[PDB]
RNA sequence: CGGUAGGGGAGCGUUCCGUGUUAGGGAGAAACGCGUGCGUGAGCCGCGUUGGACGAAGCGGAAGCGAGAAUGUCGGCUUGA
RNA sequence: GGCCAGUGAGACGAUGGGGGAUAAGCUUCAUCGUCGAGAGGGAAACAGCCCGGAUCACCAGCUAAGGCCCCUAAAUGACCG
RNA sequence: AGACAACCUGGCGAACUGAAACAUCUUAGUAGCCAGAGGAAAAGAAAGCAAAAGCGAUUCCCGUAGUAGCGGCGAGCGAAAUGGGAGCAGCCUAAACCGUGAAAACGGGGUUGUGGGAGAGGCUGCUAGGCGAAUCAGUGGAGUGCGGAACCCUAGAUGGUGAAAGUCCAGUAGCCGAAAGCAUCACUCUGACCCGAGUAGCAUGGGGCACGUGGAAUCCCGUGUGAAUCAGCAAGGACCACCUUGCAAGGCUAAAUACUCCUGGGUGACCGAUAGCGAAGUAGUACCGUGAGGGAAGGGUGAAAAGAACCCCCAUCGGGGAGUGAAAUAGAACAUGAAACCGUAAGCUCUCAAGCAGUGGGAGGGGGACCAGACCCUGACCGCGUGCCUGUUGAAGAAUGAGCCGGCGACUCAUAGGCAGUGGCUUGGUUAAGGGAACCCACCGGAGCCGUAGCGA
RNA sequence: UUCAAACGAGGAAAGGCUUACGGUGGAUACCUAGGCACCCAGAGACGAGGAAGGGCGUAUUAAUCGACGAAAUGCUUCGGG
């Protein structure tokens, strides 16, 4: 039986045939169409708002508003981009010739692609890594330390930060160090 | 993709009027009245075919009710019924009323033998 | 296995498209009016008259898709006479 | 617990009460019946009382409530008041 | 100078509505009026973005994102940079200096950002056209259709022709063609002096930027004040310091983008005369209105007028024979011709009846050119039977609605969110715009989005 | 057969129902003489050498519609057929 435009049609269930809707009262949904009688939702047009109470107070405003999210405060938007000892240990190499933003994406798992695009790695020890790799990273756990250095692996955090300081500034902190120093 | 309607209203209109071309006056030629006058006509009709079966059984009892009052001077259908049952005579009425008609001998027959 | 509001399941038709410039058709299609066929029903199916050229299925698709009510609306024709 | 409705005018009857004039087919609560959404039989006719819950066919049968002078199915039955 | 469908620039600028009322707010800088101009218009070559990493004038799409925010923190309103594309292009001018008094009014010298200056030392297309292959008969009005036998094709796109044609016609694929006109290619610095002035900023009153004055930046304005000149000025969301970026108060500029009174070419799960433009007929007509203005309805004899010579009724109209024609049960009121409504003919049947008109039972009578206990029409007389809809506690209701008959006449579409069914992938999945001998469509495009870590303001 | 009683058929209507055939009317069907929407190119004109739009004309013979403008159903030139 070869397929031919004579013989195809669809599976059961996936095409479900819809409600026209007031076409006799023995197709069901008849003459007032399931609206029952009158009122508000009867009538033709937009309905309500959308959370109304009918004037009682709503809920979404007689309670308090999230402490930090009452004027200002950014909420804690993550930085970092998280992977864990336990997801790298699925995507194997032997020498794992630095485990990075750029490995990782070529394959591990990690998608970044909007504001994610910009971050680094931190590293966190969800556990353990049965092979002896290089990482290359910003910021590990405190896990990921002890199970890094148990494993054996060249680990080396790389940083890329910079900020601008001020003269002043500079000033004050080699003031600073100069006297722990002495 | 516009959709007259066209054939579909009269074609069934036709079969509505069927039914009523016997009716009298506006009754059998009135399009929205046939309708209004077809749905009475099936209901009339289903009403009464549950009236048909104890109209009959009623006319029955008293075709046999007549025709065994002409026996003995006391002798009555109540009597008659439990006399049957007596004897254990499984005729039920419909037979016993038509024998009643078309054959009086087999009633006074049937009445000779089972007083005894 | 009564059933209003009401919910759920299963269908019938309508025009148009794919299949299809299919067969069927000026030895008569669409329509229109009649059937002592069928179905639970919506509907289906054969008929020879009127009619004078369009156009079934089946498998699928899409909607200006089903009317008796709106002091609805357009047209026709009554009643009062 | 998910998805997605209608409802938010009720009515009468029994009982327990309130209000009223222990008037109302009055009104308001509490418990239950029926109607509402329930055909059929009894009640002359008669939503709400009594019987009984209609899947469909039979020109079969038995019964409930209620009845057996005639209109109009069944005793012008019985015995005692 | 006026006219001009929309699109566009500038001026003035509503209210109903939403907020379940309403004034802040929303409707909205929308509708309207007014002025202006083009094929587009406006914008536009950084006193710009951004963050210590970088980008390089605009404009438009995807996206970021319904996120950051604003908001009687209510209704609602709602960005941008990073990222992917479409399309790319950059210019000129004034003074400091020079000459012909001198800001009498003219030419030269230069105009730039991680500082720059001058000074002194015929080609093709369009507007007409042209050539252009291949079929004949049987078929009872007519053949392109049917069965038969052929042929062409770089032509099987279309429209016609007495009936639907690749080969009958006009054409088409394919090639050919322009006198004339339109479009297209054709080393130093005195750090002298220069850096757009009633300007920026400032006080005060406003507008507008998603941002309601708020900590309110940035941009523009009435009133009053009133700077500086690259040892400068402005911006980097009050503000000061330090960094970085840029050069305001003079101008010009193609593209990608918006639209349809309109022309040519193509296409349609578009309409088919109550539809489609209001308008298939000499329609914005007839008609109404003082006027602005409103605003209809009315298609289909046949292939061919062959549209009926002649005769009869007869003043006409019209009619019947005749004749034409496939058909005149196509005669101009002409094609198919439903219902209501109006009749004519036949079968049965009502004048002691009472009835939502039926229904169950069925007396007597009648059939259909087809021999049936079958079927149909009528229906003596009996029993039952409170029109439909809406909408009610409850409606035969003397509550509402419909004179009747036929048409038109109502939960749709776009985009998002949730859920279910089905399918694909599960090396996670998926692409958006955008590109495609267009549209679909192979095949690209991984920019983004969703899932892979929570907790806390 | 005379008359007493009963019973009342068969004939007999305007109309009803059924079938047929007409008329009225213009639904449905098939249709086109006009519209509607997109896509790909264009174009967004014209006007003081008088416009957009109109009034009045212009043929051998009445009306209108288009064409045309006292050079008035047209005139000149260069091309095509």
Redesign the pocket.
Known sequence: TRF???????????????????????????????????????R?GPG?????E??QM?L??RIP??????????????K?????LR?IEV?GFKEGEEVSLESLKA????????????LPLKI???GELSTKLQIKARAF?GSAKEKLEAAGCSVTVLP?????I???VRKNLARADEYFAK | ???????????????IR????????????????????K????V??????????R????????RI??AIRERGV?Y??????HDL?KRQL?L???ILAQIAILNPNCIYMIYNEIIK
């Not at chain 2, 069927?18 to 006058?37: D, E, K, N, P």
């Open positions: 031919r435009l004579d013989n195809l049609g669809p599976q059961p269930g996936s095409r479900k045939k819809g409600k026209r809707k007031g076409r006799g009262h023995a197709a069901g949904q008849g003459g007032s169409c399931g609206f029952g009688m009158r009122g508000q939702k009867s033709s309500i708002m959308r959370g109304f009918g004037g709503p979404y405003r508003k999230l402490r930090g999210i009452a004027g200002g405060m950014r909420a804690g938007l993550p970092y981009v998280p992977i864990n997801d995507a394959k591990g798992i990690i998608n970044p692609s909007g504001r994610e695009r910009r966190l020890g969800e756990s890329g930060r910079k900020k601008y001020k003269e002043s | 993709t516009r959709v007259k309607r066209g054939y579909i209203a009269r074609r069934r209109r036709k079969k069927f039914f009523a071309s016997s009716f009298r006056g506006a009754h059998s030629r009135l399009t929205r009245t046939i309708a209004q006058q749905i009475r006509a099936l009339s009709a289903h009403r009464d075919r549950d009236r048909q079966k109209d009959f059984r009623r006319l029955w009892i008293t009710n007549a006391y009555n259908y109540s009597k008659f019924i049952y499984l039920n009425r419909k």
